[PDB]
Design a protein around this ligand. Sequence first.
Ligand SMILES: *Cc1cc2c(cc1C)nc1c(=O)[nH]c(=O)nc-1n2C[C@H](O)[C@H](O)[C@H](O)COP(=O)(O)OP(=O)(O)OC[C@H]1O[C@@H](n2cnc3c(N)ncnc32)[C@H](O)[C@@H]1O
Ligand SMILES: [Cl-]
Length: 418
Amino acid sequence: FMSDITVTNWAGNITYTAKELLRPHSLDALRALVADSARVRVLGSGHSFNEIAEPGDGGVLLSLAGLPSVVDVDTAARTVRVGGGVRYAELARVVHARGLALPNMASLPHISVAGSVATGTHGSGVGNGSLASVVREVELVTADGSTVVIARGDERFGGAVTSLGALGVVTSLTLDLEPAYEMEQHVFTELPLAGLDPATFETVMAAAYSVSLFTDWRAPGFRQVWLKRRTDRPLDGFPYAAPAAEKMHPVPGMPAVNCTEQFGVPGPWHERLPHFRAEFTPSSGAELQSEYLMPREHALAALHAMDAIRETLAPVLQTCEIRTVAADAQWLSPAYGRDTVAAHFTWVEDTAAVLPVVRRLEEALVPFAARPHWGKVFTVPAGELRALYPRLADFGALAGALDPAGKFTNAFVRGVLA
Ligand SMILES: *Cc1cc2c(cc1C)nc1c(=O)[nH]c(=O)nc-1n2C[C@H](O)[C@H](O)[C@H](O)COP(=O)(O)OP(=O)(O)OC[C@H]1O[C@@H](n2cnc3c(N)ncnc32)[C@H](O)[C@@H]1O
Ligand SMILES: [Cl-]
């Protein structure tokens, strides 16, 4: 019963030093565990790919999986209060049943809400903010066990959602909602990079509510284009690529059964925004991930820099996805303060082969002020990375106020706060 266990992230490339995952079964127990522990980090659903959740030797790794997962919709207010450990699939089910909806979702819905917003998680669409952008309040258990609630409008709130877990344990969050809406997903194949000029790139990325491009970086250009269209908005002809003949997966050869419905068949928002259907429930994945988030005005130059090194990228690549994100108010969001283009890479799970490719990719993106996704694999040096965040000092002051001893600062966060 008392024997050591091995605790990893979802993809299993990160093995934590913790020999047990503590899952307190009450908020009283959680407060006491936090107060009594010298160093703490929280594990959500483990869909990070780096050391962000590692608390160091002797540090406590705790989870909310032992507490009830509550999803409380106020229909008149159009809000939902959720536990930090609740995952997006359940959140979406419950809000949809109340006739309400989120403005966006990530690719796969089986990810914790608190952990998603902690790192900058986003979907696509030129007018759609990050997942954090709909949070209007957070509730934290701080280092001494006490609760601090921070709401939108509080001078601190810009640092309180996407915080890398550095302020305390987020026990609940409240999100804003909109009326439930219908969508259609239309997939296309073969979009050239040649002739993808500023006007055409803008037209393509704005052609639906959320648009992704996918490529293998093998033949020139893009292999797929996914349009996720609201039925309450117009859909113009899309002459730029061929209509897909078959149901598609982002990664060529992987099972398209896993993916949300295509061929433009209408269905609800939460069955169209993700790329992966709720029924698809993988307990791990044999992959790594990286993503770089740049000013949207650099999209073409960045795509052209990556095209020039395509032969270096391709051998370790499962798929690359290009997305857009609206400017974020959160100080540590990779989309902070600027409309954004994102370049995501799902790699083969071969750390030794991937890291040198990541380093070369990062070099290629330096001219475009690329910020890495905090949840994913990156090798940007700490000082260089700190220089990319205008309000980093403000964040550090907030962390110092709420957590003076740095109970929630691990090695990952320490390099951000240095
Ligand atoms: C696995 C995965 C991830 C993923 C994705 C697809 C898959 C298969 N698609 C994404 C996408 O479309 N867009 C996007 O921007 N990200 C996508 N991701 C990445 C993923 O969403 C993030 O890496 C996310 O942060 C993972 O959250 P999760 O909860 O699974 O991961 P974690 O390692 O356990 O924790 C991450 C950080 O959050 C802190 N955390 C977690 N819970 C809390 C609470 N309650 N309070 C304070 N912090 C918390 C962790 O400590 C860690 O720092
Ligand atoms: Cl091309």
